[PDB]
Write a protein that holds these residues in place. Structure first.
Motif, mmCIF file in Angstrom:
data_model
loop_
_atom_site.group_PDB
_atom_site.id
_atom_site.type_symbol
_atom_site.label_atom_id
_atom_site.label_comp_id
_atom_site.label_asym_id
_atom_site.label_seq_id
_atom_site.Cartn_x
_atom_site.Cartn_y
_atom_site.Cartn_z
ATOM 1 N N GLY A 76 -0.275 3.497 -4.364
ATOM 2 C CA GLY A 76 0.238 2.787 -5.521
ATOM 3 C C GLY A 76 1.549 2.081 -5.234
ATOM 4 O O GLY A 76 2.385 1.922 -6.123
ATOM 5 N N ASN A 121 0.666 -5.211 -5.152
ATOM 6 C CA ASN A 121 1.078 -4.005 -5.860
ATOM 7 C C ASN A 121 -0.127 -3.127 -6.185
ATOM 8 O O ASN A 121 -1.263 -3.597 -6.204
ATOM 9 C CB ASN A 121 1.818 -4.372 -7.147
ATOM 10 N N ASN A 122 0.131 -1.848 -6.442
ATOM 11 C CA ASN A 122 -0.932 -0.904 -6.767
ATOM 12 C C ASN A 122 -1.804 -0.625 -5.546
ATOM 13 O O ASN A 122 -3.028 -0.543 -5.651
ATOM 14 C CB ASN A 122 -1.793 -1.447 -7.910
ATOM 15 N N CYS A 123 -1.165 -0.481 -4.391
ATOM 16 C CA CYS A 123 -1.882 -0.211 -3.150
ATOM 17 C C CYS A 123 -2.516 1.175 -3.177
ATOM 18 O O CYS A 123 -1.834 2.183 -2.990
ATOM 19 C CB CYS A 123 -0.936 -0.329 -1.953
ATOM 20 N N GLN A 124 -3.823 1.220 -3.413
ATOM 21 C CA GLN A 124 -4.547 2.483 -3.469
ATOM 22 C C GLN A 124 -5.467 2.637 -2.262
ATOM 23 O O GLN A 124 -5.893 1.648 -1.664
ATOM 24 C CB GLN A 124 -5.361 2.573 -4.760
ATOM 25 N N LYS A 167 -0.336 -8.820 -9.517
ATOM 26 C CA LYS A 167 -0.645 -7.976 -8.368
ATOM 27 C C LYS A 167 -0.353 -8.708 -7.063
ATOM 28 O O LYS A 167 0.226 -8.139 -6.137
ATOM 29 C CB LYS A 167 -2.113 -7.545 -8.407
ATOM 30 N N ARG A 207 3.494 -1.160 -2.602
ATOM 31 C CA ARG A 207 3.412 -2.604 -2.424
ATOM 32 C C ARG A 207 3.587 -2.982 -0.956
ATOM 33 O O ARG A 207 4.556 -2.580 -0.311
ATOM 34 C CB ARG A 207 4.475 -3.306 -3.272
ATOM 35 N N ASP A 228 -8.046 0.328 -2.295
ATOM 36 C CA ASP A 228 -7.614 -1.053 -2.118
ATOM 37 C C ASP A 228 -7.632 -1.443 -0.643
ATOM 38 O O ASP A 228 -7.960 -2.577 -0.294
ATOM 39 C CB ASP A 228 -6.210 -1.249 -2.692
#
Length: 100
Positions: free
Chosen positions: A23, A68-71, A53, A25, A74
């Protein structure tokens, strides 16, 4: 012709592998031999659109991209094209603790 504009568009390709926190960047920067050429970001064979994002920053002869929101999910393959050349990289996003 030691070094010239013969067979070269990307002045600096993306790293062979990136690493970021869950989560979080990531930071993707690329240089272009000339501004005349156009840059295009793709994720798993899919054109990426500029949104909260995806942060597209253009500065002279440099193109930066933030996700952003690097899961863990992802984590996908990325490849940018410019002129008659293109490169690719692999994103490695961690998730969860390690030791304790």
């Amino acid at each position: 012709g030691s070094s010239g504009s013969s067979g070269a568009a990307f002045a600096k390709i993306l790293d062979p592998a990136y690493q970021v926190d869950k989560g979080g960047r990531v930071r993707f920067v690329v240089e272009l031999a000339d501004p005349k050429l156009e840059v295009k970001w793709y994720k798993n064979g899919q054109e990426i659109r500029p949104s909260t994002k995806y942060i597209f920053e253009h500065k002279g002869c440099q193109r930066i991209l933030f996700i952003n929101n690097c899961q863990m999910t992802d984590d996908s393959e990325y490849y940018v094209t410019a002129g008659d050349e293109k490169c690719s990289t692999e994103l490695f996003v961690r998730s969860g603790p390690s030791s304790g």
